[PDB]
Every structure is written in structure tokens, then in C-alpha cells.
RNA sequence: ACACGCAGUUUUAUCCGGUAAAGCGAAUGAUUAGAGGUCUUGGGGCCGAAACGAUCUCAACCUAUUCUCAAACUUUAAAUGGGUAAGAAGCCCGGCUCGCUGGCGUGAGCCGGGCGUGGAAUGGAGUGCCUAGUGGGCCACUUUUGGUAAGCAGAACUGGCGCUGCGGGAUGAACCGAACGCCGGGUUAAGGCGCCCGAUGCCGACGCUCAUCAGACCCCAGAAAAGGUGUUGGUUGAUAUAGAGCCGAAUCAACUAGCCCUGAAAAUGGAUGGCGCUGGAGCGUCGGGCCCAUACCCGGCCGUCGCCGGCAGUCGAGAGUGGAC
RNA sequence: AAACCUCCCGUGGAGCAGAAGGGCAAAAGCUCGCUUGAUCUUGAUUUUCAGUACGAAUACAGACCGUGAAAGCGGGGCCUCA
RNA sequence: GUCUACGGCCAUACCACCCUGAACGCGCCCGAUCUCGUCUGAUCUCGGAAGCUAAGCAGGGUCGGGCCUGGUUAGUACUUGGAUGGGAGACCGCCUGGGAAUACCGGGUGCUGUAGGCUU
């Protein structure tokens, strides 16, 4: 008889990708070997992000990647993204960059190749930089999805700015008793 | 059909099951709830911090030079 | 008269189960690495530890161990906590790998640190997994009452050695 | 059931002690309370304005706001599931400095002194506190006189 | 408190020294206990009952067993008792005949438990003194004060009733 | 070979309370009785036309005492308990900003620089989404309200049953021990060792007790006041060789505590579990030895969890190099 | 014995509208003189709390004021409900 | 040694009675034209320096009351945790720790900040 709680003994973190596509499985096997053998933690982070779901690796915009590469010191380094590189249309000047990503949009691929940059896959990254030396690891905005605007403190609560679940926004659908000082009260 | 009115018998176990937490203290607490005049003065002070920045830069450079000279004198 | 020094080392054995335990008593017991019955551990004696042992007097039986007691406990039932795993101390290599930075390289150093509590008593004691002692051979006197009144619970300053011999 | 009155059950809590009624001493009115000062709240029945609630009596908090004759204190309060760090406005008469932090400040200053000193000496000094150790075995000298016997006293009914 | 074959312990203790009282006085007591661990507890109980001294505020200076000076001589021991009944407490004086003082105290405990249903925790031992043949009040002790003492064993009920259990001969009680 | 942060814990400091207790010779309220008071006035009365002239008495009061109380009283005042602090988000300097406050000053906010184990012991932590069932409870130690009481109704803390098997209490919700994968060996807890029924088939120890209603183990399954020279101990008090007519050595009285006895009456035949037990198999205090639970220790097997686990094929056990030239 | 005047003692044993508790003595009581802060407007917080409303309250701030020599005090009732 | 003005802690500072006050100072005290307010220059306000410690005030004394601080009460009352402890219960003892309050008996009877005087 030993008094130990078993409610938090099984950890919930992912061990393998839930997708059944085979190319991702091959990349997972390659980076499993690299992470379990090489002492580099970059391979561990890449493996963990490869295990992640669609919402856990949001797409990275071209403008954000350019701005991140604009920082001093990280010049002539390979961009590593485990998500998708998406074209940004409200930017004009695109420099030459070395990018590694699972997916690159056709517009983004064309603009990157036009500027003289290079686009590589993760199997090419393993051949080029097996330990991930001289690379900048980036990711998209995790809180970019519209679901997080509905998360947090409940609406109708003081000092809360959470979007309620409404069928349609309008004059007579909300903003009444509970939100108007003239109608009962407001929070 | 009278029933039980009120009790607090099993509540302590429920409270202590999910690790009753001291509120999470975070650095740089918010300024909500402070008198408006003091906040207005602080905002005006921060608004003009950029003014006279070259004086701060020159003083910092002079202090750095003095510190380097003192380090060299010590060595 | 020569008043001997207050002992700095104590050995604590939990002598009752895990049913119907007070929250404070169970908190003290789990802070002492004593969760299963008949588990033993070494406790460094000071004001805070003395009060903690006073809280859980009915649940523990403790005393002042000898050199032979610590020798047998560390040798026969000595297990080290390596990588959060219970590993038997079958070689000095494990003890060195764990406590080399503290000058502990052999079981003799562990015995010296435990019996003669020094600067690194905390790390050496925490390295040792809590002892899994067997049931006391020859039976007990009375589990439910204090040692002063003929029972087993409480402080048995010199008589803890007999209990160790009958349990180890 | 009990009423929801604000001052219910404060018959003795918000009451001046024996032979200490009358004019409030002026020392409490002229003590400063900077931001980040640890303060323990004790209500006073003489002043009715700025009265803290009965649940904050005896609690200790930190000052975050200051007004002309009142300060804002953040005090932890447990409500049946958790501890809430909530801010209240309390007048000065119900506010006094807490002496728990001054001992720590004094020990910090002493430790800084012991760090600056004995550094060129080379001998490291013990800065951490320790609990009460064993009683440092010694000798007891019963010079001449023998120990006195203490026999139990026979019982007798006194009532 | 339990009882076994008790031993006599001499316990010396004092309150912890203080700047107000640099040299506190030393106190000693006669404690009959199965072991020294419970002897210290009984000493502290009695001292706290008499003086303003507690275990935390004091210390044990010397604890040691008192050996019988003449184990080979038969002596008469007078014991003054202080025990609690179902009703109020009472004071008693009892006499026992034994070779050792500790044996006399054990006999006193056994006799008190047998005759008055009094447990050990309810009994306080005040004074134990050896007495000569005279000054004995109890005739049970006095009847053995005879140089030419004679008595046979009239009814010797045999033991070993379960040593070989079935026998053709009935036992004998006259020897 | 290399730890931040958190705790139904304690320690060292520093605040909070008004319950237990105690007091009413201190406040409020209740309340007993004597001494000194025409303090004050008044009723019956007695010596007096009357008279504070003598004597008491009953009225509410006083002066120093005295007996007893308060959940809705209190000068005092615990144990238990409730907040904080035990450092990097901390200190020590230099300089800027301010439509705030100010005689100079404050106060706050911005930048630059220098100083790291901050009491004990134990834990890896933090954070975000969906989310079923539940929303009749009950019992027990302790505190406690109403009621004569209740296996009654109603509260506080903790632990259980509910949702839980196992050993013991013969029987069994909640009691004692102890919590569950399938097994072998050993040892225990609580309980026991005349037979049922495993184990005292000890050459057990010391005492008590006779019941024509004996007694025999928390919950628990039954008894009170009052009595007994029945018996066994303790306390106090006297007298007795100056003798408690004869015999002759110790004697009496009042209390007190154990066992037993009277008090002690209900309905189918009846239950220390039964048989039975009295040099106990009863009662009190106690020694060894022994009996076994799914508990503990060692070992085999099954599964789950964790290993920043290992293997795409290499040197290698405190790793603290290897290799050109 | 109780009409009004004078002196002394008087820790509040009075009064503060109400039920009770707390608090108050050159007051928070009584008498006077002036007034309508019982005015207009953003927020923050406290009580029950789910930490939602209503009511009640607490510190502020921005204007118009009242009062006093001034410091200051006052955006209803000394506070706990109406 | 001490006083005045403004204070801090608010009786070790209060209350009752008695004795002593050298100098400065604090007041009593002398009047109501001007300022001011009353039934009354009693209070307040104003104008002064003929007398005084009479009083306030300051210091000291009371086998003083009170107040503050100790011993006793007392390891008593009470109380955390424990028992298959006792008892029909009411209740009580023990183990492990903490630990009171009356009556009664001792000691003491204001310290101190700023500025300005006197004793030169
Ligand atoms: Mg249990
Ligand atoms: Mg009481
Ligand atoms: Mg159900
Ligand atoms: Mg305003």
C-alpha cells in the first residue's frame, strides 16, 4: 500500500504524427535518427514540430519571414519553417533567402526564386546541415486563428473583451440589456 | 419531504484535489486602479523621454570611458 | 557529570498503513519519503525536523541508529536514485557518477556522510532510495500506542537498533 | 441563516481597546507609505470612512496606489476554491507598517556587509540561517552539594 | 505505562541554564521503570508535577541503573503508595519481602493490580524503604520472621498433565 | 557532471482574534448574610401628648466585608488557528523626463554600470481548449443547537461507507488492522492458542473470586440509587497487664477501595457463538513461544507508465579526446 | 419629591429619529450664523457573488459651488438595512 | 538643575491632602477710548505693569487610592495529537507538546524632539 496519485502519470504529448502520408513518415524517420543520435537540440525541436498538428504549425507569411531575417547578425542563414510559407501581397521588395519548409505556395515560390533565393526541403537540409548549424528557426503566429478571439474570460463579464458566438452581427441581435447602460446594466 | 439544508463536508477535499494555487504574481503588474492625475503625469513624463536623449548618450559615453580608465588603472 | 551530545542523526520507520490518515500527517509523511508501511529513512535532527517528527509520532517509530545499523542498511538494502530509477548499489561506479562532485566515491564515503552528518548530508541522503524493510521478526508490542506506555510508536532512542535488526 | 450585513459579527473586532478611546493619536496620520510597501490591515472603529471589510482584518498586503488620505492595497483573499489577489481602498487610520520585512532587510544588509568584509581575508563566512543544532555537549559541575531528592507528595483533599 | 521486570534507575536533571540563573540546581529521583527510555519520561512527569520544569526547558544530566547492594539477603521493604481508584485517590502503605528493591516494587505493582484493579499509570511510587524484622505492620510478612520455621507441602498437585496423556496409573499428591 | 518554480509540512521573525479558562472585593445584569451608618426618607409597631429622646423591625441606598452566577457581561486571557517575509521580479551607484506635488525639494517613470547558492526537508513545472456524470446522502472521534430521550432533527473539522474487496469483531455499512494483477517462500498488524478451529500439549508468574441470576474483551447488544462481620486489602481514632467475680492476649469503632451477593418482573424453547469451564477454559497485572490477510520482504510471469531511453549498425564505463604535419 | 436661580462633584452612568451593536466630550451631543456637496460628468474598487446583476458603500478625477481667517471639510443622514 | 512655545508616546503622566519656589518665564492682577461680544469686560477681545506666590504651574511627601511592571496562585485551570485506557453513565487518569487568570505579596510614580531663556 503506497499513496501515490495516478491521475497525472500518463503524459499526453505526441509521439508520432497522426497523419498517414508516407513522405512525412520518411522525414520523421530521418529526423528520429538525427535527433536520437546527434546531440543537437535543433533536431529535437524539428522532430517535435513535425509531430504537431495542422493548427500547431500555422503558416508563416513572407513579410514576417523577411522582417525576422532583417534582424542584425542573422545574415546569410537558412530559414527553417515546419509549416507553410505563404505569399504576402502587400510587400514589394523581397530579398534573396534560403528557406526550408514542408510546403511553399506557388506565388511565394515564384517570388522567392525570382529574387535569387533558394528553396530546400528537410531531406536536403539534413544533407546540407545535419546538425542545423547556421539556421534560424521560425514559426507562424500560433494565436492567429479566429478561435482565440472567443477564448478567455466569458462575454457579459466585467473587463472582458471576448467575441461572443452570434449567428449574425447587427443592430437588433445583441448590444441590448446586458450591454447598454440604458437597458438594465452593462459590463 | 424535508431535505438537507447546507453543509461543507466534502468541499475541502475538492478544493485541495486540483492543487489550490496562490495567484500567479507577474512582473510589471498593470496600472489599473491608480489615480488619474498620477497616470497623466507619468504619461507626460514618458512622452518626453525621447527629448534630450543625446545628453543621456553623452553622459553614458563619458561614464563608460571613466569606467574603462578606472579598470586600466586597477590593472 | 558529562552530558553527551544530542544525536544529529535519526532513523525513522513508518509503522502503520495508509488508511484514514490526517492531511497534515500524510503531508509530513510524504515529505519524509515515507509513503509505504515499514519504510525507513535517515533524518537530520534539528528543531524543524524534531517538530515534524513530533507531528507524526503515532505513525512513525524512530530512534538513534548505531554504526552497525547504518552499515547494514546501506550495504544490504542500499539503493540509489539514478535518473529517478531505483538502482542497487552493486558497484562504486554508480556512487561516483552520482556524488563525485561532493567527494563521495565509495560506499564508505556514504556511510561516513550518513553516520557522521556533514556538509553534504542532504545530497547523500536524497541519493539513497527510501529503505524497503521487511516486517519485524518476532512481532511487535502494540502498534496503536506510544513506546513509553508499552507500544512501538514514538521515540525509542536506543531501542531502534533492535527493531532494525529484526526488520533488516 | 445569517444576514448579509457588512459589519455583522464585528462587535469586538471594530472596537477600541480598554481605556484607549477618544482622539486618534496623530503619529499614525503622518506616516508615509511608498509603493511596494508591505502593510497589515487592522480596522479602527473610531473612523467610519474608509472602513475595510471584516474579511481583510488582520490580513497583510502590498501598497500599489496612494491618494490624499488613503492608499490602495492588494491583499490575497481565499474564496472557497482559490486565492484571489484583489485590490482595496483603505484609509490611513486602518493602516500600519508591517515589521515582518524589516528583519529580512536588516539580515540582507548584514549579509552584504559580511560579503564585502572577509572577502580580502579569504575565509568564507556562514551567511545562511540554520535551525537550532544539538546542544553542544558540555560538563555539569555539582560542586560539593549532592542533587536534591524530589519525592511525590501524598494526596490530601483540600476542597 | 506498562510493567515487566522493573529496574531501579537514578535520574538527575536540571532546567536549561539561562542568563538570569547561571547555575540552576540539580534534582535527582528514584524511578522504577522497565528501561531508561521510560525512566526519563517518568522522571520528567514527576518533576513537572513537583517543579516548574518541562522536558524542553530542561535536560537529563545523568540516568543510570541502581544495582542491588545485597542481592543474597532477604529484606523487608515498605512502600508508600498513591493510586487512583474509580472514586477519588487514596494513600497506602504496603510491606513486601524480597531479595531486591526492584523485585519488591514489581510485587507491589502486581499486588495492587490484583487486589484493587489499579493499572500502572494510576499508581505513583512515593518512597521505598528497607525495614528490619520489627516495625512491620502486616502479619503476612511477620509470620515468616521465625528462625525455626517449618511447613510441609500438603497437596502437591502434579504438573505435566499432558506429558504422556494416557496412563494406567492415577497420579500421586502426597510426597 | 553542471536546475527555475510550486507545496492541507516545519523553523526563524512579524501582525490578527476574544473561544476555553478566570473575574464580578473591576464596569452591566442577577443574588445570600452578617458589622458601621437619624447618610436618606416611609410603613407597622413598643417606652413616649410628641420629640432624628432610648430600642429593634421591615423599605430601597451607602461605608469596608462575605456566598453563588451570565450564549445575547467583562478588566485579563490561552492551546489550536489565520495572513505576510526568508533576495536576481534584490540591493548599490551615474544620468535624463514630468501640463503632478513642491522655497530649495519631492514622487514616479525611463536608460548605463557592479554585485548571485539567501532557513530545514520533499517535489519537474506552467498554460489552453472541449468535456460526461453529479447537484436525495449516510456513519464515526472530537465541538455543538432543539428535544426527556431516540437507530430523532439540524451544524463545524477530519476520516470512512456510498464506489471496497481482504484478516479480526461468531453473525454485520460506518468498528480494529490493512486497501486488491496471477503465483512460490518467509514475516507481521489487528486478533487469538481446551474442542468445534490454525496455534501455550509453557512441569508460565503473582494475587482475587463460590454465585439455588457466577463471570468471561471498543462500537455491542444491557442496569441504577441503597445495603452485606461473605471475603481481601488500606485510612483514622482510642484502651490493654494501673488488666480490656471467672477464663486468658491481643481487642474495638468509624470510614474506604476490589470480587461476589440482595436490590433485579413478560410473555414460542435460548444462547460469553456452542460444548463446556471453578489448582479456570473467570477477573487484574505480566513473561517468553506459537497461529495467518490480497499487508511487508525476496523471486517468476502479465499489463500500464516513465527513461530528452538504445538499434539505419561502434568503443565503452567518475570520461576527463583522437588525429595530421 | 418635580416650576426658576447659584456653587460644587460628575469618563460620559445623557444625547446622537427608529431595533440592537460599535463609536463619539472645547464631538459625531445642545445653541447659534451662512448655505443647499441631497448639483453636473467619465471611469476604478468594496458587500452577496458565479466573483453576474440590483441596492448599498469606498477611495479618486474633471467643472460649478457652500462654509471658515485659514488649514481644511462637504458630491445626503456617524457606521452596520430602509 | 530648571522654565517657556510647539509637540511625540498618551496615568510611571491621573486623583485626594500637605510642604517648598532663588532668577527668567508662565499667571493672578489693574481698566474698557479704540477692535470685539455679552443680562453682567463673568468669558472673549483690547489697553497695561501698582502688588503676589494667595491660586494655577513646577518639585517633593503620603506604611495613600489608581496606574505600569514582577513573584505567588501554578505546571494549577485549560488545551493539539493517541490508545481494543478505566467507568453503567456522569466523568476521570495516563502518553506526546503548549500553557492561563483572581485574591495575596514585592518594585516604580514620566521619558523625550525642535527653538528660545534663567542659574550669567
Ligand atoms: Mg483504520
Ligand atoms: Mg466560560
Ligand atoms: Mg447512489
Ligand atoms: Mg470633486
Swiss-Prot record, chain B:
Residues 1-25 have a biased composition (Basic residues). The modification N6-methyllysine is found at residue 4. GO terms for cellular component: cytosolic large ribosomal subunit. The modification N6-acetyllysine is found at residue 32. One of its GO terms (biological process) is cytoplasmic translation. GO terms for molecular function: structural constituent of ribosome. The modification Phosphoserine is found at residue 30. It is found in: Cytoplasm. Residues 1-32 are annotated as: Disordered. Keywords: Acetylation, Cytoplasm, Methylation, Phosphoprotein, Repeat, Ribonucleoprotein, Ribosomal protein. Disulfide bonds: none annotated. Its main location: cytoplasm. Belongs to the eukaryotic ribosomal protein eL29 family. Component of the large ribosomal subunit. The ribosome is a large ribonucleoprotein complex responsible for the synthesis of proteins in the cell. Component of the large ribosomal subunit. This is Large ribosomal subunit protein eL29.
UniProtKB/Swiss-Prot annotation, chain C:
It comes from the Eukaryota. The modification Phosphotyrosine is found at residue 59. Keywords: Acetylation, Cytoplasm, Phosphoprotein, Repeat, Ribonucleoprotein, Ribosomal protein, RNA-binding. The modification N6-succinyllysine is found at residue 47. One of its GO terms (cellular component) is cytosolic large ribosomal subunit. It is found in: Cytoplasm. GO terms for biological process: maturation of LSU-rRNA from tricistronic rRNA transcript (SSU-rRNA, 5.8S rRNA, LSU-rRNA). One of its GO terms (molecular function) is RNA binding. The modification N6-acetyllysine is found at residue 44. Component of the large ribosomal subunit. Homodimer. Interacts with DHX33. Belongs to the universal ribosomal protein uL30 family. Component of the large ribosomal subunit. The ribosome is a large ribonucleoprotein complex responsible for the synthesis of proteins in the cell. Binds to G-rich structures in 28S rRNA and in mRNAs. Plays a regulatory role in the translation apparatus; inhibits cell-free translation of mRNAs. This is Large ribosomal subunit protein uL30. It comes from Oryctolagus cuniculus (Rabbit). The chain holds residues 41 to 208 of 208 of the full protein.
UniProtKB/Swiss-Prot annotation, chain D:
Keywords: Cytoplasm, Endoplasmic reticulum, Ribonucleoprotein, Ribosomal protein. The keyword Isomerase does not apply. Pfam families: Ribosomal_L21e (PF01157). Its main location: cytoplasm. Residues 111-122, 135-144 have a biased composition (Basic and acidic residues). GO terms for molecular function: structural constituent of ribosome. The keyword Disulfide bond does not apply. Component of the large ribosomal subunit. Component of the large ribosomal subunit. The ribosome is a large ribonucleoprotein complex responsible for the synthesis of proteins in the cell. Belongs to the eukaryotic ribosomal protein eL21 family. This is Large ribosomal subunit protein eL21.
UniProtKB/Swiss-Prot annotation, chain E:
Keywords: Cytoplasm, Isopeptide bond, Phosphoprotein, Ribonucleoprotein, Ribosomal protein, Ubl conjugation. Gene3D superfamilies: 3.10.20.10. GO terms for cellular component: cytoplasm; ribonucleoprotein complex; ribosome. It holds the Pfam family Ribosomal_L18A. InterPro entries: Ribosomal_eL20, Ribosomal_eL20_dom, Ribosomal_eL20_eukaryotes. GO terms for molecular function: structural constituent of ribosome. GO terms for biological process: translation. It is found in: Cytoplasm. There is a cross-link at residues 10, 127, 169 (Glycyl lysine isopeptide (Lys-Gly) (interchain with G-Cter in SUMO2)). The modification Phosphotyrosine is found at residue 62. The modification N6-succinyllysine is found at residue 75. It comes from the Eukaryota. The modification Phosphoserine is found at residues 70, 122. Its main location: cytoplasm. Component of the large ribosomal subunit. The ribosome is a large ribonucleoprotein complex responsible for the synthesis of proteins in the cell. Belongs to the eukaryotic ribosomal protein eL20 family. Component of the large ribosomal subunit. Binds IPO9 with high affinity. This is Large ribosomal subunit protein eL20. It comes from Oryctolagus cuniculus (Rabbit). The gene is RPL18A.
